[PDB]
Amino acid sequence: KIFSMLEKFGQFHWFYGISIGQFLSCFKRVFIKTRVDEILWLLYQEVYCQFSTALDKKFKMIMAMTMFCLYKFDIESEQYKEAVLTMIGVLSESSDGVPKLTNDDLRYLWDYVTTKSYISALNWFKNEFFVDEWNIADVVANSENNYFTMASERDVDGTFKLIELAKASKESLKIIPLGSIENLNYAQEEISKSKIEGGWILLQNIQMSLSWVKTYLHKHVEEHEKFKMFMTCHLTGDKLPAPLLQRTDRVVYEDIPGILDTVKDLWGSQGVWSVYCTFLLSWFHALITARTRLVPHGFSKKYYFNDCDFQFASVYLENVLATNSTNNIPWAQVRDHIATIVYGGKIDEEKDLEVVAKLCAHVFCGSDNLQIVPGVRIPQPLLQQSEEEERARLTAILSNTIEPADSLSSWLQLPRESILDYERLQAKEVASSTEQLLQE
Amino acid sequence: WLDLYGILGENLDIQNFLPLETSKFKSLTSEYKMITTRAFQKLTIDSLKMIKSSLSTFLERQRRQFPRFYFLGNDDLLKIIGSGKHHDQVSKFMKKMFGSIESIIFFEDSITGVRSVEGEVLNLNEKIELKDSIQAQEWLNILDTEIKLSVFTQFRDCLGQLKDGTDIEVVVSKYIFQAILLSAQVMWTELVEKCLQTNEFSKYWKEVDMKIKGLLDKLNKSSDNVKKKIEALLVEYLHFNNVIGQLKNCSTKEEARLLWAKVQKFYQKNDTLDDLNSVFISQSGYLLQYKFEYIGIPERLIYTPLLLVGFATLTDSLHQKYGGCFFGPAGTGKTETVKAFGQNLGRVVVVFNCDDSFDYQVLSRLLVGITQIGAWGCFDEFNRLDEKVLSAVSANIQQIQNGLQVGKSHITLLEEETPLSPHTAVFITLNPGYNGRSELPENLKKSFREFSMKSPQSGTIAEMILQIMGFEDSKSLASKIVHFLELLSSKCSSMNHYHFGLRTLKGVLRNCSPLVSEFGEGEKTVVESLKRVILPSLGDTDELVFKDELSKIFDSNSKAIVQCLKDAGQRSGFSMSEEFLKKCMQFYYMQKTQQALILVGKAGCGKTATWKTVIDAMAIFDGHANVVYVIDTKVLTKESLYGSMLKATLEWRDGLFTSILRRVNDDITGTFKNSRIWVVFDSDLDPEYVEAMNSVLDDNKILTLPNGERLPIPPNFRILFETDNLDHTTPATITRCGLLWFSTDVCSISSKIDHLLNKSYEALELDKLKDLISDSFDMASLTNIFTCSNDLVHILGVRTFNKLETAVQLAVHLISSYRQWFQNLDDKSLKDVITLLIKRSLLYALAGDSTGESQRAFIQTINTYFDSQELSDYSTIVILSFSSFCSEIPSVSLEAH
Ligand SMILES: Nc1ncnc2c1ncn2[C@@H]1O[C@H](COP(=O)(O)OP(=O)(O)OP(=O)(O)O)[C@@H](O)[C@H]1O
Ligand SMILES: Nc1ncnc2c1ncn2[C@@H]1O[C@H](COP(=O)(O)OP(=O)(O)O)[C@@H](O)[C@H]1O
Ligand SMILES: [Mg+2]
């Protein structure tokens, strides 16, 4: 059943095709890492963790929801299945009706969906059933394969994540972009060299040398343990070869859809005042990246905010704090620079400039007590503490922060109706896909 | 031969580098000496071109010796290395290798100084002595160092004088512009910092105001060098006055400090013993180092808030050795912002017009050219590169940035290790969201910092520039100009080529600058400039909208040029109508200031006639000779228009346009000294063909070849575009060109008929026949016939205005053929024969592309619209009497086989 689902996803998009070697390797890894039902449960968790990273966010939640549906329909009774069907129906706006009262999880999801929290309802299945997730690092670490390919939408790249992975594993990359004869020749020479004594190689934009990819890369993957190959492709580009794709692990790098998760990621990617300014910058970047995905009302267009903007704003903050030791830090200067220079260069519309200026005014007000989100308040640093204690305090105040189910509107300070429209459209598409998928 | 003898036959210890090439040179020298002796008493050129193949590595090493040779062609490299003792061929390449330096002043085998493009003279601190045995690169290196040292010495002297308390009006007449600029800006930032130490700003505001008034008063009585110097100092001093006024209007101290941190501040170190690195430029906390390269007297940019924010983001990008990226629509000030930033940082920015023909090797060669020099690279129109090339050069750009950040000495690009100068940087300016342009991959876009400049501040630019010419009323006039442009953009028919951004305003200012000599500094001048720039590009109803709005928002001889155009039209046979002469006036007044012009209209509307007769009028008016190089754009491939690099041996083959540009640049025979050169692109305006000329069309006036050559565009070198529609033409091409729109035909039917008859008669007693043919073309019946022709069904639909070619040519040719039997008949018979023949010609010229029934209908209507001899469906003339086709059929008896 899971295998048929996976080839249905492969029918949906050319990047999501699944071979039998990967699935059987996953089945072996299940035993590598009431007994038959427990084996089934570990199978479900391992296959979800492995094949979630090969899909973008909508297909992630689609597969998570239909897989939890399959498992619980096997385990539970018929009334539970009818309740799940009618709750997906009211999620899909196809069948409207209250589910039959019986345990407790269904009540939680009923409270999630009656409060018009569609995103919470979609992600509640990931919250409850699947208790593990895999990033790029976990995929590369837990793979016996020798070759990797990475796919992402245009105007977003995960090359810096692979660079961070290489620095974490104390390896060496060799960025060889594709597109010209000299680059192809140097790629062949480096491939031979790093096959005969090891080392990592990363190939950029492999969908732009498709003839070379179809010949040389196919015949080389077809035929040192400290050697790895990374490839970068686009989801909306040309069709990569199926025999090449099924022999390489596939990872889809997309921005983290959460807010507190983005703050935690940017905080884990790293005097006292530099730590405070880095914390505020990470919060600002997470909030603006959460806001930029609401196309019609969050911004006037679709804007990208990558690690380069965070790096440049952090460098500017360090430069200001080092060159102003009098501790009367010019918050107006920092606000104007970040809202106008670093994060505002990409912005072309004046209303979006106004809203980024308002966001910078909210996050960099320079007050002793700042309520950056309606739940969490951060104090200013004292004059008798150190860097380690400040980092511990800010990590503790991040851990105690709990993201509510209404964080897409209240945290971004936006009207509810646009959030209702966006979440309703997203949930309707996801539930229509899983209703077309689950019945067959 | 001279180049070969210079590189090998004259220099000592230079033949041992390549002994095989030395032997080949000796054999060719013997053969050519024998040939020259035989001539003094083909194969040689082929042998020379063969032995240039081994000279490629020698030239590459020579370019490694002096890195600025990368901006020169191989032929120019041969010329400069072969200049063993002449020492004049080297001076002609100063503009190619430096950009701001035109030639070197020589005085009795010694270097006195260098001269800028604008005529400014920079005198070196010490004269450079040249010996016979020295080759080019050593004394070019020491001249390069001496230019920077001289610029610093002049800056230090001017800054000491300004610290001494003297007025700037006495020092502007003594030093170069860059020294005055840097010293004045250091004094300005020191005085503003001292005023910021207190709460007092009004006294320095008054001081700066009366300094500006004194400079404006002394402007009118100064030489052209002093005129340009004073104008640039007014640009900078108006920036000073705006900043001081903004600081005075500030309510509190903290916002005053923020506003001060938002603006450039040029300081000077007092402890470092290195003279060339004593000046550092501060902005928003960051510090950038001056380079003291010779700049000259450029056309300085008005310091708009958008320009200041762009400078801030460029400084923020270059503090981490990243790239500068500017994205937005056309005519917004991206490349000019980059160039003004470079001129503020004391170095000439080298601009590259990227193209689809720029493959990985070409772009990487330009990268190793500019990183070895240390120059700043403005990759103009970076979208035009292919996506594969954009992906491929990402590694090279990343290596450049990594070497700049980590302070590495060498970088490995194109399989060769070359030194990395630490003063280099990369800038790109691109226009997203246009048809037929590639998209930058994210792995490349993460190496640049983009900054949107969609909306410039045209009001401030107009106000300050009109103040610089010295208009009595500037604020109200600039506000009226900007409001007029906005309401003209809002109240006109929204067709694709109506663009009213910054470029047309700036063209209005360039047209108003030399028009005050005849209209005076006032509102009449600006309304005349507005007419002369904007009216030729508007339609018919939009012309009425323009006139009504001009009368609403603004209150309000050239006989010689009209006489010259009338004479030219009489010689060419055209008719000086109202519309034709209006288009001639529009083209002449628009080309008087604008170099590149696009002529747009229907097929056969009068474009070629217009520009040919205006060129004839200019030639007969000024007396200057004129050459025209009409190039069919889409007939030739891009590799045949600009040139292609032969990948077999990495040589450059000139395209047609580049060959014409090189021929007009070199000027071997001296005949292009006082001539105007028009190059006409009589084809469709393909974006891929004419956006490779983007740096050519705008104020850069330079053609960036793939092989690094930088051919300057002479002022007397104008480009004409002759097309039919602007459906696929991007606004980047439209705004750079003064457009001339042909809404209707410039010629009436009768005038076209008369012109065709006179031209055909000139292309051939004759007087009586010509008079009878002219009288036979009865225009009163002709217009009815032409109006009745519009009701037919036509295959290969052509308007009836352009069928007069066929009719007139057929009639004249058939009359000339029948002229043999025209001396033995009566006048009435001749008139009837000519009338019948012209009726047949008109039938087969107008309805000849119609069916049999339609041709019968048309021959009936041409019979009833003309006593005259009746033309039938099978009427003909036999050897001179009327007959039919029935009696002309020969009997045919075909055999079986
Ligand atoms: N003022 C005029 N007086 C007489 N003849 C004229 C006049 N203007 C145009 N013509 C005639 O119009 C005809 C077509 O015009 P013209 O040669 O200018 O075409 P064009 O603009 O070059 O067309 P295309 O779209 O083919 O480039 C020519 O034969 C020319 O003689
Ligand atoms: N202060 C100024 N700021 C911006 N542009 C100016 C200024 N003064 C004059 N200009 C004019 O604006 C034009 C800028 O062209 P630009 O937009 O840089 O070309 P591109 O679109 O290729 O970047 C130039 O033709 C220049 O004459
Ligand atoms: Mg540009």
UniProtKB/Swiss-Prot annotation, chain B:
Where is region (AAA 1) located?
290-511
Subcellular compartments: Cytoplasm, Cytoskeleton
Segments crossing the lipid bilayer: none
- State where ATP binds: 328-335, 601-608
Q: Which residues form a coiled coil?
A: 213-237
**AAA 2, as annotated region:** 563-793
Q: How does it assemble?
A: The dynein complex consists of at least two heavy chains and a number of intermediate and light chains. Interacts with DYN3.
Quote the entry's note on domains.
Dynein heavy chains probably consist of an N-terminal stem (which binds cargo and interacts with other dynein components), and the head or motor domain. The motor contains six tandemly-linked AAA domains in the head, which form a ring. A stalk-like structure (formed by two of the coiled coil domains) protrudes between AAA 4 and AAA 5 and terminates in a microtubule-binding site. A seventh domain may also contribute to this ring; it is not clear whether the N-terminus or the C-terminus forms this extra domain.
Q: What does this protein do?
A: Cytoplasmic dynein acts as a motor for the intracellular retrograde motility of vesicles and organelles along microtubules. Dynein has ATPase activity; the force-producing power stroke is thought to occur on release of ADP. Required to maintain uniform nuclear distribution in hyphae. May play an important role in the proper orientation of the mitotic spindle into the budding daughter cell yeast. Probably required for normal progression of the cell cycle.
**Annotated family:** Belongs to the dynein heavy chain family.
Q: What else is known?
A: Present with 195 molecules/cell in log phase SD medium.
Question: What is the name of the protein in this document?
Answer: Dynein heavy chain, cytoplasmic
Q: Which organism is it from?
A: Saccharomyces cerevisiae (strain ATCC 204508 / S288c)
